Every structure is written in structure tokens, then in C-alpha cells.
Amino acid sequence: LGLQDFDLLRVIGRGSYAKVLLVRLKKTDRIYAMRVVKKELVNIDWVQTEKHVFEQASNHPFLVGLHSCFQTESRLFFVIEYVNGGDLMFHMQRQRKLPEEHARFYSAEISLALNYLHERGIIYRDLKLDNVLLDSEGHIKLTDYGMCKEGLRPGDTTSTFCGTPNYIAPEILRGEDYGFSVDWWALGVLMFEMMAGRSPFDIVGSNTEDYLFQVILEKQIRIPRSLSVKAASVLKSFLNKDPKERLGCHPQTGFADIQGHPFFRNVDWDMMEQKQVVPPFKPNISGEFGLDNFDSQFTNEPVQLTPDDDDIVRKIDQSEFEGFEYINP
């Protein structure tokens, strides 16, 4: 399609590779979110990765799916389903701290989603509060596929150093080759944040990234003692710095191990995958699109695209982008 097919309503975010907009398909007045990527950032086959993952997302409830895909001379566009509940970064700023029951719910749904990607050879690589979105009904969706690695087979590994430092696994920091194990670590950090109301690394939330990397590799994490033994135990299991011994990471039993953990014993996993468990919290939809659930530092921005510089535009291979246009049936 084309930019002219849509009406550009508000800016709602800054992704890992993208600027995220709220748009309306003018021909239908349907509303969608739209990820806009500067080709100057992509031209390894990233586009291939992105579309490969969007393809998996159609078939799972906890992964945001793709409506369509188009391009101008300077940018890529992905029109994706709009999730108006907001993300967990916003939820945590507002809630401060979540009860164990809430955290169990979100982590269960997140586990399903990670496991779904893994079984199909994909490492997510950017699991974090900002990248977890709430459905209007209160269920979660993983968005942002920018850092994904796909095609990973058993015994296959990668070595690419990337992610969000707060959530970067120890094996990456040591410069080892790594697999799915890093998502489970990231989930670890994320569960800690939900239940303790802060990052397990003090400097985050209080200075160079290198120090953060050291803190991650060196400090023993300290679990708040108010937490139940179940909760505590799952956190230390996920935040084991040796990926060989970390919860979820065994090659054969990894997901079962999670599901068999005492913290999750309270979970009917298949009723969960089917969205038949009731969310512990129901986002409040303003009626104004639910834009209230988005950081104002975005929503108070002109929806204007920044004109392209003809020095760079002509100096980028439009060929790495052939036959990119797409519509989901």
C-alpha cells in the first residue's frame, strides 16, 4: 500500500529501530499501530527476519501480528495490530509494585510466547518492560522484533552482542556463543522488576554502561525477603548466571521445568494459552483511543515525518528491499 492510504494520528513510541505511530486506514477507518524504520538503519537480512517473525505472530495470541507492509524511498512501514492497553513500563510507573499473583499471570503469558518463538528457531533478544503490551482485556502481547534472531536449529548458537543492557544475559557479556537461554534470563530480570518494583541492579533506577555490565557479572542479586519462597526461588532459578543450569534452559525439558516450578504450579497452562484465564487487571480505556495509556513525551509530538536528505536517500541500495510490500489475508 502507501502512506497516503493512512491517516497519521499520533506518535505513541520510540522502538528499537522504529518510531511507532497510531494510524487509521482511511479506506476503512480501522485503527492500527505503525512501525516506521529508516532504511538508513537496515541496509545479514533484517527485513527477512522481521517478516519471518511476523509470520509466526499470526498464530499466537501473545504476539502482535502484521496487517501490512510498504515502503517510501527513505523508510520501511509495518502496519501492526493496535494494543491500546499500554506497556508494562507504563504499568509499573503507575502501579509501583505488582503482587505475586499479577506477576505470575504476566510471566506465564510471556513464557508461552517465548517458548512459541523458541520452538520455531527464534531468539527474541529484546525482552523488556517496554516491549510487553497490555490488551484492552488485560492479556499481554510481545511487540518489537527488531533484535530477533531466526533460523536457529538445535545446537545452533549465535554470538551477536545486542539487547538492552539492563536485561543482557551474563553469557553475552562474557562474549560466549548463546541460544534461547538469554530470553529466560531477561524474563528473570523482568519478573524481579514486577515483584520488587525496581531493577535487580541498583544503579539502574538511581556512570557508564560498562560498569552496569560489571555489576551484572559480579554482584550476587539480593531478593527482597518479603517475597514468598516460591517467588524468590523462581527468580534465583532464572537469574542463575550459568546458562547451563538456568531455569528453562535445558535443551529437552526447559519449558516443562518452568511449568513444573512451584511458582507456576498455580497455572493451568492450556486454559492460559487459550486466553480463558481472567486477567488480574483490566486496563482503563479512555475512549480517546486509550492514548492516556501512552507516555506523553510521545503523544505530545507532531506526527510529522522528518524530510529525507537526498545525499543519503540516493546512497542506499533499494535492491535489498525488493518485493517488500505485503498484506496479511
Partner: peptide, 16 residues
């Protein structure tokens, strides 16, 4: 910690 979660603050910025 009042500023526990700061969007895109220290350590919360994506990188590759």
C-alpha cells in the same frame, strides 16, 4: 526509589 523505572534512561536503551 521514585525514579525506579525511567523510560529510555540509563541501561534501558536498546543497542547492537
Amino acid at each position: 526509589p521514585v525514579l525506579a523505572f525511567q523510560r529510555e534512561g540509563f541501561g534501558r536503551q536498546s543497542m547492537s
